[PDB]
Amino acid sequence: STGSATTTPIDSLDDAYITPVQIGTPAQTLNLDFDTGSSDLWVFSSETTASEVDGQTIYTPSKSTTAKLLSGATWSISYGDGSSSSGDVYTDTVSVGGLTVTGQAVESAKKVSSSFTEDSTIDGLLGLAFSTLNTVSPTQQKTFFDNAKASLDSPVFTADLGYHAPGTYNFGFIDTTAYTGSITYTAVSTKQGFWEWTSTGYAVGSGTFKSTSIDGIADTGTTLLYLPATVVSAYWAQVSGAKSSSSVGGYVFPCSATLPSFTFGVGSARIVIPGDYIDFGPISTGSSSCFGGIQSSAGIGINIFGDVALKAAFVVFNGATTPTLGFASK
């Protein structure tokens, strides 16, 4: 089997991407944030505290003939941005792009933090990291990918995120029309439950490439590119008037600037992030200070190749017995 679904930016900045997902029978379609940095499939639901729902579409298990309470199971998750959610668990039929899993754990939120409530466009998350990170207790549950894997034509999914445009998540096949050149594969460590890999270095604009190992994660659920302070300082030093602002919470730059590109290494291959991908616009409406898309990881504990990086590539998440990541230009 295979599946193929379009993913759409939630706003003009590409702050996140939403992908329609069918849950239950008859189908209830929710728009979920596919997140390769977490491992829970959770949704706004009929159980979510009413004051914490503001425009989201909800999953109502009582209206699904295939929903079953997963008795005694609870979940609770905290993300890198400080957001959180928790609740109970149903099993139900879940389909993405024509690919169906029966008996998928659908984590129904009873509570969500303010950042979720305030984002009316995101109806929940679909985790695509390793199932070792799933938070369901007392019986950990599998991701949609892990449950689909044995049925897929190839045990892979691909992320093809758009810059200010829709893109695609495919399951079970590699669309050889969707990228240019060849795919470079690189090793993955699953020790922390992430798609963790080591970049071979970076360049700023037309500058020379610096060969250096940068361990980090491929995380579709993170907007920006978070790298070591040395790398980030080297990038922003090439932008007149850029500075790190403790009041704003990262590097800002004059909105009048033209940003340089940023290149990262994948083995001997190179992915180039155009400068415009690094512009996240005014820090507040009407400001002439703009927020940078490359930020320091120093206060995180991990480097994160988020959407800023991943949208410059066609990315293969190879879930074979020995997982690997692949990157191609596009």
Side-chain angles (χ1 to χ4, degrees), residues 16-62 64-67 69-109 112-141 143-148 150-190 192-242 244-318:
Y17 298 80
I18 51 173
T19 309
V21 177
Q22 282 70 50
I23 310 180
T25 308
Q28 300 180 38
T29 298
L30 274 66
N31 296 329
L32 306 187
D33 185 350
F34 284 22
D35 181 12
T36 64
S38 69
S39 306
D40 288 49
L41 191 176
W42 73 260
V43 296
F44 280 78
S45 74
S46 58
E47 301 181 329
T48 308
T49 300
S51 63
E52 294 182 350
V53 181
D54 185 8
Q56 295 81 8
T57 295
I58 63 169
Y59 169 60
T60 302
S62 66
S64 174
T65 59
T66 43
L69 181 73
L70 186 64
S71 183
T74 63
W75 64 278
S76 181
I77 194 161
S78 303
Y79 295 103
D81 65 352
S83 65
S84 61
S85 54
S86 63
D88 62 9
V89 187
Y90 294 81
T91 58
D92 209 340
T93 301
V94 172
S95 297
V96 176
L99 169 66
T100 299
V101 167
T102 58
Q104 176 62 48
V106 176
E107 301 172 35
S108 166
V112 302
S113 66
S114 63
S115 57
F116 288 116
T117 299
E118 290 165 2
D119 187 358
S120 64
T121 68
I122 291 176
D123 304 322
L125 268 65
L126 189 149
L128 292 169
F130 292 87
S131 293
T132 58
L133 295 178
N134 175 266
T135 77
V136 178
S137 177
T139 308
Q140 189 171 60
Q141 300 293 305
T143 71
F144 175 82
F145 179 56
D146 221 331
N147 282 323
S151 306
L152 295 176
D153 290 357
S154 183
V156 302
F157 66 92
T158 65
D160 182 8
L161 300 181
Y163 169 66
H164 297 343
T168 305
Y169 283 102
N170 291 329
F171 292 84
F173 68 108
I174 289 168
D175 182 354
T176 62
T177 75
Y179 61 86
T180 59
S182 59
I183 307 178
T184 301
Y185 289 86
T186 198
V188 164
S189 173
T190 65
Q192 296 191 88
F194 299 122
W195 292 94
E196 187 171 3
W197 64 290
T198 304
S199 171
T200 53
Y202 69 97
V204 176
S206 58
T208 59
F209 185 82
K210 177 71 167 179
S211 288
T212 186
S213 294
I214 303 175
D215 178 289
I217 65 166
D219 183 2
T220 60
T222 291
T223 314
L224 305 186
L225 173 53
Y226 294 89
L227 290 175
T230 48
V231 175
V232 173
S233 181
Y235 177 80
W236 288 109
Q238 297 305 312
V239 178
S240 299
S244 184
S245 171
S246 58
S247 55
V248 174
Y251 280 90
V252 295
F253 69 92
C255 298
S256 59
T258 306
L259 296 180
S261 66
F262 184 89
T263 300
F264 63 95
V266 183
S268 59
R270 306 289 178 254
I271 300 292
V272 180
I273 305 171
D276 291 349
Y277 290 25
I278 298 163
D279 177 13
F280 278 77
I283 60 169
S284 301
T285 306
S287 179
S288 72
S289 292
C290 276
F291 197 67
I294 297 177
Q295 296 294 345
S296 178
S297 64
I300 303 184
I302 202 155
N303 300 306
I304 308 173
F305 293 83
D307 300 333
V308 164
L310 301 181
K311 75 181 69 178
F314 178 87
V315 188
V316 179
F317 295 79
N318 170 27

